[PDB]
Paper text:
The N-end rule pathway is a proteolytic system involving the destabilization of N-terminal amino acids, known as N-degrons, which are recognized by N-recognins. Our findings suggest that the UBR box of UBR4 recognizes type-1 N-terminal arginine and type-2 N-terminal amino acids containing an aromatic ring, such as tyrosine, tryptophan, and phenylalanine through pi-interaction with two phenylalanines of the UBR box of UBR4.
First, we determined the ligand-free structure of UBR4UBR. The structure of UBR4UBR, like other UBR boxes, is composed of three α-helices and two antiparallel β-sheets. The UBR4UBR coordinates three zinc ions. One zinc ion (Zn1) is canonically coordinated by two cysteines and two histidines similar to the other UBR boxes. However, whereas two zinc ions (Zn2 and Zn3) were coordinated by six cysteines and one histidine in the structure of the UBR boxes of UBR1 and UBR2, two zinc ions were coordinated by seven cysteines in UBR4UBR. Besides differences in the residues coordinating zinc, there was also a structural difference between UBR4UBR and the UBR boxes of UBR1 and UBR2. However, in the structure of UBR4UBR, there is a unique feature where the aspartic acid residue (Asp1721), which is one of the main features of N-recognins such as UBR1 and UBR2, is located far away from the ligand-binding site. In other words, in UBR4UBR, Asp1721 may not be involved in ligand-binding unlike other the UBR boxes of UBR1 and UBR2. First, as observed in other N-recognin structures, during crystallization of UBR4UBR the amino acid at the N-terminus was bound to the ligand-binding site of other UBR4UBR molecules in the apo UBR4UBR structure.
Residue numbers in the entry: 1657 to 1729
The structure:
Amino acid sequence: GHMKLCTFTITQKEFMNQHWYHCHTCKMVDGVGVCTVCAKVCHKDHEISYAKYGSFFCDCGAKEDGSCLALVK
Ligand SMILES: [Zn+2]
Ligand SMILES: [Zn+2]
Ligand SMILES: [Zn+2]
């Protein structure tokens, strides 16, 4: 099937309920995190740790420089 991309590309309102992760290599901790896809693609081998499930949007995909590797381009 398709290759799932960053949940930011499908977050149609500001937030969406989902599992999300911390990346200590990128110091994206606390209130900052990444979706299930970006933990596996953009932060592969990047000292990832489960955060929680809840209301969230992905800070990897949202980054304005477009450096997320899991966007539609
Ligand atoms: Zn993402
Ligand atoms: Zn990282
Ligand atoms: Zn990403």
